[PDB]
Amino acid sequence: MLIAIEGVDGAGKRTLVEKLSGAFRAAGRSVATLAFPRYGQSVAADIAAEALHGEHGDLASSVYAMATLFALDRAGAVHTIQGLCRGYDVVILDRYVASNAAYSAARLHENAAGKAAAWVQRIEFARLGLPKPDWQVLLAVSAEDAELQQRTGAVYAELAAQGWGGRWLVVGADVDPGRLAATLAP
Ligand SMILES: N#Cc1c(-c2ccc(C(=O)O)cc2)c2c([nH]c1=O)-c1cccc(-c3cn[nH]c3)c1CC2
Ligand SMILES: [Mg+2]
Numbered sequence: 001m002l003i004a005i006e007g008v009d010g011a012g013k014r015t016l017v018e019k020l021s022g023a024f025r026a027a028g029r030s031v032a033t034l035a036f037p038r039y040g041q042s043v044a045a046d047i048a049a050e051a052l053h054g055e056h057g058d059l060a061s062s063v064y065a066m067a068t069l070f071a072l073d074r075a076g077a078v079h080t081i082q083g084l085c086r087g088y089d090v091v092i093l094d095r096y097v098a099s100n101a102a103y104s105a106a107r108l109h110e111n112a113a114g115k116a117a118a119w120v121q122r123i124e125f126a127r128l129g130l131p132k133p134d135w136q137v138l139l140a141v142s143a144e145d146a147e148l149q150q151r152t153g154a155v156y157a158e159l160a161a162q163g164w165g166g167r168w169l170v171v172g173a174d175v176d177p178g179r180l181a182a183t184l185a186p
Contacts, residue, residue: 002085003184004096004133008153010144012173016137017094023181024090032084035094037073044072063107067100067120074100075128082131090185097124098136098159106152112159121165135184136160136168 005013005020014035021031037045048069051059059065074097084091097120104116111117124130138160140153160168171180 001090001135001184001186002081002093002131002133003090003135003137004093004098005137005139006095006098006102006156007139007141008144008149008156010149011139011141012144013094013139016139016171016175016177017092019177020092020181020184023177024185026178027181027185029089029185030087031090031092032088033092033094034077034080034084036077036096036099037070038077042073042076044069044076048073063104063116064119067104067116068123070100071097071120071124071128074124074130078128078130085131093133096133096136097121097130098156098165100124101159101164102152102156106148106155109151110155112155112162112164117155117159117164125165132166134166136164136166137180137184138168138170139173140170141173 005017007013017033021033024031039045039049047056048066050056051066101117101120104120105112105114108116125132138156140157157170160170
């Protein structure tokens with residue numbers, strides 16, 4: 001099974017990934033995890049981060065250019081992902097393709113039915129061949145650029161409501177990981 005944990009910066013995704021990992025292992029399931037972006041490994045990722053800090057000229061001024069970089073990072077891990085899916089009962093990704101759809105649409109003031117979110121699916125899933133996750137879990141919290149972070153949180157909820165890329169669950173800060181694992185497990 002392939003699961004992506006999503007949410008805005010500060011939501012506490014990593015804590016949820018660890019909680020869930022423990023829950024799955026307590027249920028007798030092997031688990032592997034991977035986090036995106038792969039800063040320090042993927043040059044496309046590193047350039048994107050650097051661009052967010054003002055390097056690389058006008059790069060960060062293009063939503064679609066930034067999206068393309070994070071897509072190339074994930075696409076570089078496509079075989080690692082498929083490997084882990086063969087080797088483990090459950091694979092948990094701390095961010096995945098929906099991160100690109102939510103941040104891109106939020107930046108363009110589009111909704112989850114808009115052009116950027118559709119483009120992300122065509123490029124990452126169809127073109128670059130990334131596997132669709134069995135489940136996408138949105139961690140939605142009251143609080144972790146604030147206006148943008150809040151709008152991204154909302155677009156994320158819209159992706160969950162529409163079933164963008166597959167089935168989702170929306171969870172809060174105090175979700176019971178034992179219960180959540182039983183829900184996610186086939
Ligand atoms: N993974 C991922 C991922 C991320 C992302 C990475 C790390 C964190 C973190 O460390 O919390 C948070 C988010 C982003 C985008 N796309 C992705 O795929 C994306 C997509 C379009 C535009 C922009 C943008 C350009 N100016 N402002 C925003 C972005 C930036 C954020
Ligand atoms: Mg627009």
